Design a protein around this ligand. Structure first.
Ligand SMILES: Nc1ncnc2c1ncn2[C@@H]1O[C@H](COP(=O)(O)OP(=O)(O)O)[C@@H](O)[C@H]1O
Ligand SMILES: Nc1ncnc2c1ncn2[C@@H]1O[C@H](COP(=O)(O)OP(=O)(O)O)[C@@H](O)[C@H]1O
Ligand SMILES: Nc1ncnc2c1ncn2[C@@H]1O[C@H](COP(=O)(O)OP(=O)(O)O)[C@@H](O)[C@H]1O
Ligand SMILES: Nc1ncnc2c1ncn2[C@@H]1O[C@H](COP(=O)(O)OP(=O)(O)O)[C@@H](O)[C@H]1O
Lengths: 71, 449, 71, 443, 438, 439
C-alpha cells in the first residue's frame, strides 16, 4: 500500500522511474545484448533418465519430464 | 603481443638426443632440469601412463614456472595443459576435492567425430494441430505442428512433435523465415528472413539470408574437441533437451555441483563406446599444480586415490619451500611442504640458482624480448643486481629504465637510466631497511606494526 | 552427449515425414519395476505400498493445519 | 583403451589358494605380504558369506607396504557379485552435507538389494515397416521382422507406431523391442541391406541378422543400493541427484521406512540383501566426530564390512589435541582388528619391479633389473617403479630395444629420490623459503 | 539372518517382580543396571510423564548400548524408539537446536486405525454421469461391481490414463488409485503395442482390511511445513528448489499439537510418547545441553536416554569447563544416572558362549577358555571378534568346530590395538624409509 | 490429554496478594523465594501497566532455585492477554540468519498489536445453484435453521465455477472480501458416493443464521507483520521459518504505520515480555546488540536467568560475574534466588507428588526430604516417579520408604555419580583419551 515504485510510474517527469532502471538500461546501452557470444559449453546433454521395462514408467516420464501444465 | 614474465620462453631447447643446449628456446642453464622436463614431455606424449607425479623443487625465481610453461609449448595445442595454483582449490560452492577432480578431468581431452543430422529451409507453411484434453485444468494442448520447409533443391513438409514446436515457438519462428533444426537435440535456430521480400522498410532490423543451397535434409559431420569434464558438466546440469528440466535448467542460476563418482564412472563407459565405435581419440594431458605447498593434507590425501585412478593425467607440482609445516597439519613438518608419504609418489626435479653470467644472458634475452635496446655497460649494471638482489629485480628495472631513457631522449638505455631506475624503484631489502630505520620508534610518522 | 535416431536414407524418406523427439541420454539408469513402480517409491500408493494412501490423506488433509476446517 | 597403465593395474586378485586360504608366494600380481594376504582372504570369505555384519578391519603398515594393493586385490577378487565402495576420508568434508551424513551415504552405498525380473524382448531384422500416417498420423501399420530362423508380421498399435517413427525404424534395421515398455533400441544395420543406407557414412558398421526366435523372456538381475533407494525417494527426480550430487541431508524417516520395506521384500522373497564392503583409505583423515558416528553405525544390521588403511604412527587425532596409535581414538580401535603390512625384502622388490616391468611394455636387461632392485632397497619401491617408465623413455630416445644400465643411471641422475630431495632441501635452506617465511634471493 | 553386535540381546531379562535374572534374554550381569532400565521401561509404558532424562554412565564395552537396545525391545515396535548419536546433530542445513527438536518429535508417535476398502478389477464400464459424477464398473474373476465416483476421485482416475479394459486398484476411503495395467483379455487387440498386459484379478473385486497406521509428530511437521511429494514437482530442479530442512517455528508445532489433540478427542488417533536415545552424549556441546534443558520442560517431550563413557572431561564448546561424563553439572542434575560396571572373567566366558551360538560358531571348551582369556587380558570386544575368523579358518581346515588351533591362528592374523601399538612403538622409532608417519 | 505432566505443570501463577504484592508462603504451586516472588510481582505490575519500555531483569541463583519456575509463574500470572516470548539463548545461533536478526525477531515477537473487528460471514450448505444466460444466477443455502435464496453477480458465478461448488457442499463467503471458501461437504452426503477423493471431508451443517456479524479481537506480533511483509506470501514463513535477514527499511515502515494505527485508534499496542533463559550462552556480540535494542520505545521488558558464577564471557577470554559483560550488567537489575530450607523442600515435594498423583506415606516424604537436602531438589523429585513405579511393580497401595530406598539404590545422584567417575577413572575415557579395557 505504501511503495514509491507505484508513484514513480505515474509522474510525468520520469526521474525516479529512470533511477530505478539504471541497471537494465546501461546493460542494454553497452550492447552486451547484441555482442556475439564469446563462449558456450563445449558439450551438451539431455537429462539422465530412468529406464524401466514397464508402461507406468513411460507414462510417468511423460507426466514429469514433459509436464503439460508447466509447459 | 603484450610482454609478460615468460614471453621469451618458447620451449625446452633440447636436442633430438634429449640433451639440453646450454642456451636455447629462451632458456639459460637449468640444463639437467630441462632434460628431466623433456623426459616428462615424452611420458605425456606416450599415452600409456596415468597418474604419474612430478615435482619441480627449488627456491623462488629459479624458473620452475618457466619449465612448466615450456612443457606446455613442447606438448603443443592438441594436448590439454591445465594450470592451477593450490590456492584455487578452496571453493565456496563445492568441497575442495571436487575442484581437484574437475581439474583432473579437465586435463584429459577427447577428440570425437560427430554427425549433425539436420533440416534447413525457408519456412513456407506452419500449421498447428491440437486436442481438447480431458479436464486437467490447463486447457487445450497442441498435438503437433505441420511445417513446410523449402530449400534450393527440394522441399519437405514436417509433422513435428510438439516439443520441437516449443523450440520453434521459443525461437519466435514465422512463416518466411529461414530456420535450422537439429534432430540430435530437437533444438531450433532462426537463421533469418528469406532474401525474398527483403524490403528495406522494416524497423525490425532483420538479417535477410539466402535460401539454403542443397536439399532440405542434411547429415553433416564435424570433429569436436572436448574434455571429460565437459561431459560431466553437461550431464550433471542437463540443458540440451527440449524437456521441462532442460528448459528450466537454462533459466536457473548456474552453480557448480559435487558431481558423483557414479556419474564419472558411467561417462567412462560412454566415452569408451565412442572409442570402440572409432569416433573418438582419447588424448590424456597434464595438470600443473603451481604453489602446491598451498594444498592442505586433505588435498594431498585425496590425490593419493585420484592418482591411483585407472585414468588420470600427469600431475606436475611446483614448490619453493624448505622444511615447512604442512597446511592443515600443524603437527607435521616436511620438506617441500609436501606430506612425506605423498612425496614418495613423485619424481623430483630439483632446480638450482643461476650463476652471474647466466643472469647476464637472461638479462640480454629479456631486454631484447621487451625490445629494450641496451648498452653493454648497462647490461653489466643490471646484471650486478640479480647477484646482489633477486633476479626478478633485474628484469623489472628494464621497463622503467626504457621509459626514463626515452624521456631523456635517448634511443637506448645507458647506465644513467638504470641508476635512476634503481633510485625510483626499490627492491624489498632496501625498503625493509627503510621500515626498520623509520619504524625504529613509534609516533605520528611511524610505520604501523 | 546423447542418443538420437539417425536418418538412414534420404532417397527413401519422402516429402512428408514425422519428426519425433528422439533425444535421450546415453547415461541410462536401469531400475527394476519392483523399485520404480511396485512400491519402492514410498509416495506412490498401490498394492504393497499400503502406507502411502493413508499417509497422503491424513498428513495433507485431515491432520493438516491449512485445511479450511482446521484454519 | 580408456584404462591406461596405473600403479595398481597389475593386481588381478588376492593371489590366494581358494581351497585353503594359503597364500601362494606370488600369484595374481601380489608378491609376499603372505600373512596380510591370508588375513584379507579370511575377511574376503566372510564378506562373501554375508552372515556377519559391521565388522571393521584396519590395514596398518608403513607407506608402500602394499596396503592399497591388498585392498585392490580384494576388490578384484569380489568383482560384481558384491558392492565395493572406496572412500578417501577427505571426501566426506562436503559443503553440501554434514560429514556424518556423507558418512551415512557411504554406508548405504555398500548394501545391495538384488532384484530378479523378466521381460519378453522381441529382436530381429526389420524386413518392412508400412505406416499409413493417414492430417494426423499413426493410424495403422504393419511390421515384418525376421531372424535367421523365423519371419513374422505384426499389426502395430498406434502408440507403437509412434515409437517406430520416433526411432526412425527402417528396413534392414536390427532392433530389440522391450514389449512392456515399448522402447526400441536399434542394435545395428544388417549387412545385407547395406546399400539402402545411402545416408550413412562409410564409417558405419554393419551386423549379421539375429538368431533364433523373434521373442524370448530375458531375465535381468538388478542390484540397487540402499543409498539409491534413499535418494530416489527424496524428491520427484531423486535419482537425478545420484549423478549431479545435490542430494541434501536425506531425512532419517525416509531411511527408516526403506529399511522396513527392504525387510518386507526379503521376507516376501521378492528381493535379496547383498552386504558389500566400504573401504576407507587413510582413515586417519577422519576426525573425532566421525569416529563416534562410525562406532554405532557399525552396530546396525544393514552395515557392510568396513576396511581401513593408515600410514600413521602414534599421531594427533583430528579435531582434538591428543595423540593415539594410528591417529585413531582407542574407543574406536577397540572395535577394530588390525592387519599389519611389513617392509619388503630385496627379492620381493625384484619380483614387484619385474611385474611392473611386465605391466608396462618394458624389456629390462638383467643388470638393469638388478640396479633397479638396488635402487629399490636404497630409495624405496615407488621410486624405482617410476624409474622403469623413465628408463624406457630414455632408451627410446637412444632408440634402444631394451633398457640398459645406462638408461637407469640417466633416470637416477635426472630424477631425485625422496632422501636426496630432502638432502637438497637441507643444503638449500637459504634459497628455499623456511617455515619462518625468510628467504635470501641473492647469489 | 545376519548377526550384528547386539543381535543376542532379546530384552532385559527381568523377573515378574522386576528383579533381573543373573543370565537371561542374552544378558549376563549388569543386574542393577538392567533393573534400573526396567523402571525406565515402566516409566515409558505408563506414558504419564514428559521429558524425564536418563544417563547411562560407565566404561566402554560395559554394555551401555546393549541396555538401550534391550529397552527398545521391551517397548516393542509400537512405541517409537529414535536412536541418534550426539554427533549426528551438526547438520549443515539448520541449527543443531532445530535438529534436536526434530528428533524429540520423532520420539512421539501417533497411531491411527484405518479401514481400507480396496476395489481391484478390470474396468468394464466408465459412464460419466453428470455434466461431475462418474460411474465405473469393475470386474474380477469372481464378479463385477459398480461404483459411484465423486468428481475428485474421477479426475484422479482420469489423470491416470485409465480406460475400459484396463486393470486398476482403488482405495475407497483414501482416494488413492493406480493403473495396474491392461487386461490380457485385450492382449491380441494388436500384434504389437507399447502396452503392459496383466491377468484379470482372480480374487474378490472388493477387499476390506484394517491397517494400524503409525505416524510421528515430526511427520506432521514436515507435511505441514512444505508441500511434499507429488505436490512439489519443481523440486526436480534441485538447488533452491530441493526439499531443504528449515528451522520450523514453534507456532507451527503448537498449531500441529492443537490439530492432533482434536483427533485424539474424536478418538481417531492414539498418542504414543516414546524414547529419544542419544549415544555419545559427550559429543553434544554446551549449546545443545543448554537447549535440552529447556526442551525437556515442554509438556510433550519424550523420555531421553543418554549414554556417555567419558570420565572427567572438557565439555565441547567450553574447554574452560571440565565435568564428569562430559555433561555440564547444570544439566546432570536433571538426569537419573545408571552406572554400568566392568565384567568379571566368568561373565566374559558366558558372553562368549552366548555370542558363539548366535553367530552359529561352535567351540571346544579349550577354545572357549582361550577366547575368554583374550576377553579378560585385552578386551571383551576383541575376543568376540575372534569368533568369526576362527570359524572360517576351521572351515577351510575341514573342521566342524573351532578349536585352539583356529583361535591361535586368528589371534595372529588379527591383532588388537594394544599389540599394534607395540608394533608402532618398535617400528616408528624413527622417520626412516620404513617408518610409520608421525 | 496431549499435555503430559512436566517439571513446571504445578506452577499455576505467581502466588502473591494482588493488592499489596506481598507473597504468601505457598500458593499457586510456588513455595518460598518470597523476596524473589515479590520482586517478580513488581516486575509483573510494570509489564501489565506497560508504559515502562525496555527494562532488563536478571534472575540469578544456583541450580534448582526456582529461576525458571518463577519465570513460568510470571507467565501464568500475566495470562494469555500479553505476549510472553520464551527464548533459549541457544536458539539465537541460527544458520539461516545472523544473531542480531534472531534477537531482533524475538524482540518483535514480544510486542502485540491488538485489533477488534466485526465482519459479515455467510456460511451454509449449498442446496442449489441456478444460472441464466441471455450473466446472472441464484444461490439457495440452508442452515439447520434457515433456507434462503441469494442473487449472485457475474463474478460470483465465476468464483462458484472456478471452485467447483456443488449442492451438498458447505461454503463460506466473507462478504467483506467477497471471496468464497469451500469448507467441505455436509455429512448428509456421506452416502451420496461410493468413493471419495483425497481432498474431501465431511462436516456438520452450519447452525443458526446464515450470515453472522461476530465481533472478534485480534492480537498479532510485530514479528508477524514483518514476516507477512517480508515477501508476497510471507505468512507461510511464519510456520516453516524460511525467512531471511529482513530488511530494516521494512520494519521502519511497519513501526511508522503501527504508530498511525495507535494514533487513529485502529489498534492498541500490547507490550509483552521476552524471557531469555541461560542468557550466559549469548556472546559479546549479542549483549552489545541488546544494549541498543532495549533503548527503544517498542522494546519489551526482558527477563533473563543465569546460574553462572564468575565465568568467562563467550566470544572472549576474560571472566565476569554471571558470565555477562559489566557494560551489559550496568543496564540490568538483578533478582537473587536462594537455596531452599528442608521445610520448603518438604512442601515442594508434596506439590510434585500431588501433580504426579503419587500418594507418599509420611515417612517416604520425610526420607525423600532428606534426599532433597543431601542430593538436591531435582533428584528427590525424580525419585517420586521412580518410587511410584517400583511400588506399582509390587502392587503397593502407597509409596513406602522401601520404594524410595530402592529408587535411591538404583539411580545415582550427581554427587554419587561424580564419585563413581573418580573411582573408575582408568576404565573411562580421560580428557587425554587414555583408557584400559582390560580386567
Ligand atoms: N633458465 C632460464 N632462462 C631464461 N629465463 C628464465 C630462466 N629461469 C627463469 N627465467 C625467468 O625469470 C623469471 C622468474 O622465474 P620464475 O619461473 O618466475 O621462477 P619461479 O616460478 O620458480 O619463482 C621469469 O620471467 C622466467 O621466465
Ligand atoms: N605385495 C605386492 N605385490 C605387488 N605389488 C605391490 C605389492 N605391494 C605394493 N605393490 C605395488 O607398489 C606400489 C605401492 O604400494 P601401495 O599398495 O600403494 O602401498 P601403500 O598403499 O601402503 O602406500 C603400488 O603400485 C602397488 O601396486
Ligand atoms: N551384559 C551383557 N551381556 C551380554 N552381552 C553383552 C553385555 N554387555 C555387552 N555385551 C555385548 O558386548 C558388546 C559391547 O558392549 P557395548 O554395549 O557395545 O559397550 P558400550 O556401548 O558401553 O561401549 C555389545 O555389542 C554386546 O553385544
Ligand atoms: N519455589 C518453588 N515451588 C515449587 N516448585 C519449585 C520451586 N522452585 C523450583 N521448583 C521446581 O523444582 C524444579 C527445578 O527448579 P527450576 O526453577 O526449573 O530450576 P532452575 O533453578 O535451574 O531454574 C522444577 O521442577 C521446578 O518446578
Amino acid at each position: 500500500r505504501e511503495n514509491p515504485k507505484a508513484v514513480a510510474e505515474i509522474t510525468t517527469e520520469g526521474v525516479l522511474r529512470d533511477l530505478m532502471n539504471i541497471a537494465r538500461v546501461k546493460y542494454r546501452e553497452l550492447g552486451l545484448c547484441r555482442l556475439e557470444k564469446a563462449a558456450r559449453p563445449r558439450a551438451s546433454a539431455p537429462p539422465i533418465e530412468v529406464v524401466c521395462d514397464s508402461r507406468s514408467a513411460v507414462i510417468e516420464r511423460e507426466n514429469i519430464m514433459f509436464h503439460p501444465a508447466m509447459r | 603481443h603484450r610482454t609478460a614474465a615468460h614471453t621469451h620462453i618458447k620451449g625446452l631447447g633440447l636436442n633430438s638426443s634429449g640433451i639440453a643446449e646450454k642456451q636455447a628456446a629462451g632458456f639459460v642453464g637449468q640444463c639437467a632440469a630441462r632434460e628431466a622436463c623433456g623426459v616428462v614431455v615424452d611420458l605425456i606424449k606416450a599415452h600409456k601412463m596415468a597418474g604419474r607425479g612430478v615435482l619441480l623443487a627449488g627456491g623462488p625465481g629459479t624458473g620452475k614456472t618457466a619449465l612448466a610453461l615450456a612443457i606446455s609449448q613442447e606438448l603443443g595445442t592438441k594436448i590439454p595443459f591445465c594450470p592451477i595454483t593450490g590456492s584455487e582449490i578452496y571453493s565456496t560452492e563445492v568441497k575442495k576435492t571436487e575442484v581437484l577432480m574437475e581439474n583432473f578431468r579437465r586435463a584429459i581431452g577427447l577428440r570425437v567425430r560427430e554427425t549433425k543430422d539436420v533440416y534447413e529451409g525457408e519456412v513456407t507453411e506452419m500449421t498447428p494441430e491440437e486436442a481438447e484434453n480431458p479436464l486437467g485444468g490447463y486447457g487445450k494442448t497442441i498435438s503437433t505442428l505441420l511445417i513446410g520447409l523449402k530449400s534450393a533443391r527440394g522441399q519437405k513438409k514436417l509433422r513435428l512433435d510438439p516439443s520441437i514446436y516449443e523450440a520453434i515457438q521459443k525461437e519466435r519462428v514465422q512463416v518466411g523465415d529461414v530456420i535450422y533444426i537439429e534432430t540430435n537435440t530437437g533444438a531450433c535456430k532462426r537463421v533469418g528472413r528469406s532474401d525474398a521480400y527483403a524490403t528495406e522498410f522494416d524497423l525490425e532490423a532483420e538479417e535477410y539470408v539466402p535460401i539454403p543451397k542443397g536439399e532440405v535434409h542434411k547429415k553433416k559431420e564435424i570433429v569436436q574437441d572436448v574434455t571429460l569434464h565437459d561431459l560431466d558438466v553437461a550431464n550433471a546440469r542437463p540443458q540440451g533437451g527440449q524437456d521441462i528440466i532442460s528448459m528450466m535448467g537454462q533459466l536457473m542460476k548456474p552453480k557448480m555441483t559435487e558431481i558423483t563418482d557414479k556419474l564419472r564412472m558411467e561417462i567412462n563407459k560412454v566415452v569408451q563406446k565412442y572409442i570402440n565405435q572409432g569416433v573418438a581419440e582419447l588424448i590424456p594431458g597434464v595438470l600443473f599444480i603451481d604453489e602446491a605447498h598451498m594444498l592442505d593434507i586433505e588435498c594431498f590425501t585425496y590425490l593419493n586415490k585420484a592418482l591411483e585412478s585407472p585414468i588420470a593425467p600427469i600431475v606436475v607440482l611446483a614448490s619453493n619451500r624448505g622444511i615447512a609445516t604442512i597446511r592443515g597439519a600443524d603437527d607435521l613438518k616436511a620438506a617441500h611442504g609436501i606430506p612425506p608419504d605423498f612425496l614418495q609418489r613423485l619424481l623430483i626435479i630439483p632446480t638450482h640458482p643461476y650463476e652471474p653470467d647466466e643472469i647476464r644472458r637472461i638479462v640480454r634475452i629479456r631486454a631484447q624480448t621487451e625490445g629494450v635496446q641496451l648498452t653493454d655497460a648497462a647490461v653489466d649494471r643490471v646484471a650486478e643486481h640479480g647477484v646482489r638482489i633477486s633476479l626478478r629485480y633485474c628484469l623489472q628495472l628494464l621497463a622503467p629504465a626504457s621509459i626514463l631513457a626515452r624521456v631523456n631522449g635517448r634511443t637506448q638505455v645507458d647506465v644513467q637510466d638504470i641508476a635512476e631506475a634503481e633510485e625510483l624503484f626499490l627492491d624489498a631489502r632496501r625498503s625493509a631497511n627503510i621500515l626498520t630505520s623509520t619504524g625504529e620508534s613509534g609516533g605520528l610518522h611511524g610505520f604501523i606494526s | 552427449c546423447g542418443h538420437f535416431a539417425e536418418t538412414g536414407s534420404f532417397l527413401r524418406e519422402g516429402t512428408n515425414v514425422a519428426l519425433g523427439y528422439s533425444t535421450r541420454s546415453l547415461v541410462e539408469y536401469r531400475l527394476p519395476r519392483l523399485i520404480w513402480c511396485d512400491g519402492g517409491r514410498l509416495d506412490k500408493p498401490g498394492p504393497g505400498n499400503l502406507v502411502a494412501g493413508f499417509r497422503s490423506k491424513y498428513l495433507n488433509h485431515m491432520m493438516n493445519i491449512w485445511t479450511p476446517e482446521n484454519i | 583403451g580408456l584404462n591406461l597403465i596405473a600403479a595398481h593395474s597389475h593386481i588381478r586378485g588376492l593371489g590366494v589358494d581358494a581351497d585353503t586360504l594359503e597364500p601362494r608366494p606370488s600369484s595374481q600380481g601380489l608378491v609376499g605380504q603372505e600373512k596380510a594376504r591370508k588375513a584379507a582372504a579370511v575377511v574376503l570369505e566372510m564378506i562373501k558369506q554375508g552372515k556377519i555384519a559391521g565388522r571393521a578391519v584396519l590395514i596398518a603398515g608403513p607407506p608402500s607396504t602394499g596396503k592399497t594393493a591388498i585392498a585392490m586385490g580384494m576388490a578384484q577378487s569380489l568383482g560384481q557379485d558384491v558392492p565395493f565402495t572406496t572412500l578417501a576420508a577427505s571426501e566426506i568434508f562436503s559443503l553440501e552435507m554434514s560429514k556424518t551424513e556423507a558418512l551415512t551415504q557411504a554406508f548405504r552405498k555398500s548394501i545391495g538389494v538384488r532384484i530378479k525380473e523378466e521381460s519378453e524382448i522381441m529382436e530381429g531384422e526389420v524386413v518392412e515397416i508400412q505406416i499409413d500416417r493417414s492430417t494426423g498420423g499413426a493410424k495403422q501399420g504393419k511390421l515384418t521382422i525376421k531372424t535367421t530362423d523365423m519371419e513374422a508380421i505384426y499389426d502395430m498399435g498406434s502408440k507403437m507406431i509412434d515409437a517406430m517413427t520416433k526411432e526412425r525404424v527402417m528396413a534392414g534395421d536390427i532392433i530389440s523391442i522391450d514389449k512392456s515398455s515399448g522402447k526400441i533400441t536399434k542394435l545395428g544395420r544388417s549387412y545385407a541391406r547395406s546399400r539402402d543406407y545411402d545416408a550413412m557414412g562409410v564409417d558405419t558398421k554393419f551386423l549379421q541378422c539375429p538368431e533364433g526366435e523373434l521373442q524370448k523372456r530375458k531375465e535381468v538381475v538388478h542390484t540397487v543400493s540402499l543409498h539409491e533407494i534413499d535418494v530416489i525417494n527424496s524428491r520427484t527426480q531423486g535419482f537425478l541427484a545420484l549423478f549431479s550430487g545435490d542430494t541434501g541431508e536425506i531425512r532419517s524417516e525416509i531411511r527408516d521406512q526403506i529399511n522396513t520395506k527392504v525387510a518386507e521384500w526379503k521376507e516376501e522373497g521378492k528381493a535379496e540383501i547383498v552386504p558389500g564392503v566400504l573401504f576407507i583409505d587413510e582413515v586417519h583423515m577422519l576426525d573425532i566426530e566421525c569416529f563416534s558416528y562410525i562406532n554405532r553405525a557399525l552396530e546396525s544390521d544393514l552395515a557392510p564390512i568396513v576396511i581401513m588403511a593408515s600410514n600413521r604412527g602414534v599421531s594427533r587425532i583430528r579435531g582434538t589435541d591428543y595423540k593415539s596409535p594410528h591417529g585413531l581414538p582407542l574407543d574406536f580401535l577397540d572395535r577394530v582388528v588390525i592387519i599389519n603390512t611389513h617392509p619388503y625384502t630385496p627379492d620381493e622388490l625384484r619380483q614387484i619391479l619385474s611385474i611392473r616391468a611386465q605391466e608396462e611394455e618394458v624389456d629390462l636387461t638383467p643388470d638393469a633389473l638388478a640396479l633397479l632392485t638396488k635402487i629399490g632397497q636404497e630409495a624405496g619401491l615407488r621410486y624405482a617403479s617410476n624409474l622403469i617408465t623413465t628408463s624406457q623413455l630414455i632408451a627410446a630416445k637412444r632408440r634402444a630395444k631394451q633398457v640398459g644400465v645406462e638408461d637407469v643411471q640417466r633416470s637416477f641422475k635426472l630424477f631425485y629420490d625422496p632422501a636426496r630431495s630432502v638432502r637438497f632441501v637441507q643444503e638449500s635452506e637459504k634459497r628455499l623459503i623456511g617455515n619462518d617465511g625468510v628467504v635470501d634471493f641473492s647469489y
